[PDB]
RNA sequence: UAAGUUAUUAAGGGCGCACGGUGGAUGCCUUGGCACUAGAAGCCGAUGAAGGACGUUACUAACGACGAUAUGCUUUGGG
């Protein structure tokens, strides 16, 4: 989605998205505590572009 | 006082009509079928098939879509 940095910082944002905002707002939405809960499918699908842009690269 | 004749009763039933219930025929309709015509096409698979199991949404029991990038992603045209 135009991110267009450095293949590092691709790996970084994966790891940042993959577990902490997505594995987070997983905890929140079960013990009570998520409102927003439309933040979950937008960090899934920057998950998914952070992905593909760096599977182009190959 | 005597002789004689005759009638109302309807527990319930019969017929005729009036009004309800049941059940889903018929009329009209069609989301779908049937039989065909002209033109594509007549194979997929070890780069893992046809077919399926399990999952995916903020909930999700099921059906469609999808596959740990999961109720979908990028990019090039239409709108």
Known sequence: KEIRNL???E???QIK???E???NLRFQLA???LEETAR???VRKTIAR???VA????
């Not at 599977?55 to 190959?58: K, V």
């Open 7 to 9: 293949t590092t910082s």
């Open 11 to 13: 790996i970084e944002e």
């Open 17 to 19: 998205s993959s577990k």
């Open 21 to 23: 905002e997505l594995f």
């Open 31 to 33: 013990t009570g505590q």
């Open 40 to 42: 979950i499918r937008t």
């Open 50 to 52: 952070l992905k593909t």
């Open 55 to 58: 599977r182009e690269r190959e």
